[PDB]
Every structure is written in structure tokens, then in C-alpha cells.
Design a protein around this ligand. Structure first.
Ligand SMILES: O=C(O)CCCCCOc1ccccc1CN(C(=O)c1ccc(-c2ccccc2)cc1)C1CC1
Ligand SMILES: CCCCCCCO[C@@H]1O[C@H](CO)[C@@H](O)[C@H](O)[C@H]1O
Ligand SMILES: CCCCCCCO[C@@H]1O[C@H](CO)[C@@H](O)[C@H](O)[C@H]1O
Length: 267
């Protein structure tokens, strides 16, 4: 009965995921393996791509131009905000989330979206770079390394996490549950109805446990491995937030999007 009810639960969350995210891991890995994106690996190809690739965010809508490293940061920032939007619609497509009072919904999103973003980011990452512009471009890890501090520093740790997370070989059906577990997290500060969020979280984690038994029958220790990845993401986001505070302090000409400011306001 428990195993049965949780199967239906997991399907409803997978459907919310397919409905709301712009790219699946299945799509992204098929592009990344060739089963072609324009490669951005230096200033000239960055320029050609801004001339020749279709970006969700028209380049004129980015903040005013400053320099190459900041331009790259602005595109990272636009994508981050776009993914907050998708995560919000994903969360709202989950009935037990939509039943929480709107203020707790905000609290969960505030402290959860970056963790979820960096987990999902892995889907479009390999050891050599990552997909951009809805898969029509590929930016190399080496080029991102070449940007000036503090912008190269805030990027490289995400690759390190991603290459390790991708070795677990989750598919989209696993990720939908994993992400749901990250957002529906009863530990976040200032939650109003904690026992309710704890109850939902535990349901998701039991559903995820059974899902991996069925979907990855020969993978050992995969559930506890993923719990530890949830702990790892928390530390990745702590470090991210600290790097953002230094960018705010030392790079005063760099615009920071007000929604992300609201997230960092008191972490
Ligand atoms: O959190 C904030 O306050 C926003 C600030 C985040 C800053 C750190 O963003 C990073 C870091 C590591 C890996 C990926 C991202 C950003 N990102 C992206 O999808 C992304 C988008 C565009 C590019 C790009 C690079 C060169 C040329 C053209 C485009 C690269 C990456 C994932 C959403 C998270
Ligand atoms: C059900 C809709 C009506 C909700 C009204 C309650 C709003 O409370 C506010 O929730 C915010 C988190 O979202 C906190 O940042 C604020 O400190 C808090 O004051
Ligand atoms: C769009 C979903 C993600 C939203 C993330 C941003 C949340 O910001 C918070 O909004 C609250 C009022 O709602 C304020 O009380 C807090 O001061 C502020 O930190």
C-alpha cells in the first residue's frame, strides 16, 4: 500500500517536472554526446554567439555593458532568475506545496532554489563545459576559468560538484523527486508550519527511496549517497552566497538582479 501510493506520488511530481522545466537531462545528454552546439571558448566566439545564437534574454535587456567577465556574469544571472521562475512553477504544480500558505511557499523557495539550481545544472554539464542558449551553444570550462577573479572562482566549484553528481547517473524521473526534496525542506529558517513541511519532505524521501529501488535495482547505497549530496549542496550554496557577498563588496559596478538580492538579504 505504501509502495503503491508513493508510486502515484512520484509520477505526479515527474509530470510537474516535465511540464515546467525548459530542458530535460535526457535532452541535454543527447546534445552533449552528439546523439551541433556552437562552441564558445574565447572572446571572438563569445561575440559571434551574441551575434548568432538565440538567447531567451535579448542582449539589449541585460544590464549596460561593462567588460567580458561581467557580461558573462550577467548571462549567468539572467539564467539563474529564469530557473527560479521554472522552480516556482514546478513547486506550485505540486499539490502539497500549493496548500502551504503563500508565505511558507516563499520561505522554501528563498532558501531552496539555489540548491535546486546547482543540482539541475549538472544535467547540462560535462567535464569540458556546459550548454547555453537552450542547447544551441556550449561554453568551455577552460574559457570560464580564464575570466578574472571573482567571476572564475564562483563558477568552477559548480563543475566540481556536477561531474561527481553526474557519475550517479540519475535520470529525469529521479531528479524530479530529488529536487522536490530539496525545496520541501523542513529545516529552512523562519518556516511557519514546520511539522507540515517535515511531513511532506518525508513523503518525498520515502517515494524517492522506492523509486530508486525500481529504477536503479543494481545501484548500491544510492539513496544514502543522494542524502549526502543534499548536504553537499547546502555547503555549495553557503560558499556561493559568501562569494556573492564579496562580489557585492568589491565589484560595485556589477549590477545585481533585485530578486537574487532578496534571496541573499539574510542568509
Ligand atoms: O546566484 C546569483 O546571484 C546569480 C549569479 C550566478 C553566477 C554563477 O553562475 C554559474 C556558475 C557556475 C555554473 C553555471 C552558472 C550559471 N548558469 C548558467 O546556466 C550559465 C548561463 C550562461 C553562461 C554563459 C557563459 C559564457 C557565455 C555565455 C553564457 C554560463 C552558465 C546556471 C544557472 C546556474
Ligand atoms: C497567505 C498570504 C498572506 C501571508 C501574509 C504573511 C506574510 O508574512 C511574511 O512572510 C515572509 C516570507 O514569505 C517573511 O519574509 C516576512 O518576515 C513575513 O512577515
Ligand atoms: C519567487 C520565489 C523566490 C523568492 C525569493 C525571494 C524572497 O525574498 C523575501 O521575500 C519576503 C517577502 O515575501 C521578505 O519578507 C524577505 O525580506 C525577502 O528576503
Amino acid at each position: 500500500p505504501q509502495v503503491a501510493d508513493l508510486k502515484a506520488f512520484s509520477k505526479h511530481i515527474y509530470n510537474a517536472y516535465l511540464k515546467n522545466f525548459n530542458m530535460t537531462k535526457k535532452k541535454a545528454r543527447s546534445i552533449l554526446t552528439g546523439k551541433a552546439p556552437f562552441v564558445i571558448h574565447d572572446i571572438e566566439t563569445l561575440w559571434q554567439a551574441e551575434k548568432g545564437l538565440v538567447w531567451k534574454q535579448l542582449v539589449n535587456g541585460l544590464p549596460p555593458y561593462k567588460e567580458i567577465s561581467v557580461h558573462v556574469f550577467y548571462r549567468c544571472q539572467c539564467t539563474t532568475v529564469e530557473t527560479v521562475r521554472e522552480l516556482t512553477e514546478f513547486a506550485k504544480s505540486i499539490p502539497s506545496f500549493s496548500s502551504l500558505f503563500l508565505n511558507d511557499q516563499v520561505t522554501l523557495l528563498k532558501y531552496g532554489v539555489h540548491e535546486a539550481i546547482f543540482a539541475m545544472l549538472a544535467s547540462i554539464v560535462n567535464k569540458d563545459g556546459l550548454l547555453v542558449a537552450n542547447g544551441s551553444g556550449f561554453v568551455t570550462r577552460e574559457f570560464l576559468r580564464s575570466l578574472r577573479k571573482p567571476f572564475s572562482d564562483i563558477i568552477e566549484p559548480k563543475f566540481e560538484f556536477a561531474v561527481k553528481f553526474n557519475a550517479l547517473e540519475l535520470d529525469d524521473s529521479d531528479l524530479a523527486l530529488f529536487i522536490a526534496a530539496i525545496i520541501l525542506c523542513g529545516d529552512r529558517p523562519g518556516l511557519m508550519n514546520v511539522p507540515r513541511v517535515e511531513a511532506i519532505q518525508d513523503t518525498i524521501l520515502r517515494a524517492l527511496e522506492f523509486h530508486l529501488q525500481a529504477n536503479h535495482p543494481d545501484a548500491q547505497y544510492l539513496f544514502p549517497k543522494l542524502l549526502q549530496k543534499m548536504a553537499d549542496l547546502r555547503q555549495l550554496v553557503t560558499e556561493h552566497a559568501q562569494m556573492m557577498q564579496r562580489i557585492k563588496k568589491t565589484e560595485t559596478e556589477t549590477s545585481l538582479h533585485p530578486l537574487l538580492q532578496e534571496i541573499y538579504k539574510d542568509m
